Curated annotation (Swiss-Prot):
The third RNA recognition motif, called PUMP domain, is atypical and may rather mediate homodimerization and/or protein-protein interactions. Its main location: nucleus. Homodimer. Associates with the spliceosome. Found in a complex with RO60 and Y5 RNA. Found in a complex with FUBP1 and far upstream element (FUSE) DNA segment. Interacts directly with ERCC3. Interacts with CDK7 and GTF2H1. Interacts with SRSF11/P54. Does not interact with ERCC3 in xeroderma pigmentosum complementation group B (XPB) cells. Interacts with ARGLU1; interaction may be involved in ARGLU1-mediated modulation of alternative splicing. The keyword Phosphoprotein applies. This is Poly(U)-binding-splicing factor PUF60. Isoform 2 is expressed in colonic epithelium and colorectal epithelium cancer (at protein level). Isoform 6 is expressed in colorectal epithelial cancer but below detection level in colonic epithelium. Expressed in heart, brain, placenta, lung, liver, skeletal muscle, kidney, pancreas, spleen, thymus, prostate, testis, ovary, small intestine, colon and peripheral blood leukocytes. Coiled coil: none annotated. The chain holds residues 118 to 311 of 559 of the full protein. Keywords: Acetylation, Apoptosis, Disease variant, DNA-binding, Isopeptide bond, mRNA processing, mRNA splicing, Nucleus, Phosphoprotein, Repeat, Repressor, Ribonucleoprotein, RNA-binding, Transcription, Transcription regulation, Ubl conjugation. The modification N6-acetyllysine is found at residue 131. It comes from Homo sapiens. Does not repress TFIIH-mediated transcription in xeroderma pigmentosum complementation group B (XPB) cells. One of its GO terms (cellular component) is nucleoplasm.
Length: 190
């Protein structure tokens, strides 16, 4: 896949269809509900009877997030149906290419991480499951503070599995959202 194609596959893989949305709910509600999985980049909710259509397309900044929201979102809110944009099929080959590639790094995604924790803490907390090759938390450029999520590459596959199975929904005051990475480190490259 070309640098551009991979950049377009990642974009689609971060989109999640949300349906059965009560008519009295707006993007702010949806946003808050899915935020646990990674900061929400944008929301595309389609609205002469200015009310909407109870479906939205939430777009995360990284596909790993979309992957988790889909696995953990089957809550009420007014019930809702989660799925994927029916056009991913056009980027499926690459998406599969990114999947195959991802399996070479015992890479894991970690969302909903408290502002006070740092790359160290997270590292500290996670190395308990195995030697950690890399441990970094995404950060805001204009600030520098982590965006509440990051990635952790383990030395051993077993280590990343133990980490995942043990930390998904781990406390404190919030619940961490963890799951295996669905993409390699530099997706647009090769």
């Amino acid at each position: 896949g070309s640098a551009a194609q991979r950049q377009g596959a990642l974009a689609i893989m971060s989109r999640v269809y949300v349906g059965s949305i009560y008519y009295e709910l707006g993007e702010d509600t949806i946003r808050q509900a899915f935020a646990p999985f990674g900061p929400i980049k944008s929301i595309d909710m389609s609205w002469v009877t200015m009310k909407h259509k109870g479906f939205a397309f939430v777009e995360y900044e990284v596909p790993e997030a979309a992957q988790l929201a889909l696995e953990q979102m089957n809550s009420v809110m007014l019930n809702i149906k989660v799925g994927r944009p029916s056009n991913i099929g056009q980027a499926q080959p690459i998406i599969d290419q990114l999947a195959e590639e991802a399996r070479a790094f015992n890479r894991i995604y970690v969302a909903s991480v408290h502002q006070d924790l740092s790359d160290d803490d997270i590292k500290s907390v996670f190395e308990a499951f195995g030697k950690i090759k890399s441990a970094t938390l995404a950060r805001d450029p204009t600030t520098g503070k982590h965006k509440g999520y990051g990635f952790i590459e383990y030395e051993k596959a077993q280590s990343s599995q133990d980490a995942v199975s043990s930390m998904n929904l781990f406390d404190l005051g919030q619940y961490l959202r963890v799951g295996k990475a669905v993409t390699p480190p530099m997706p647009l490259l090769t």
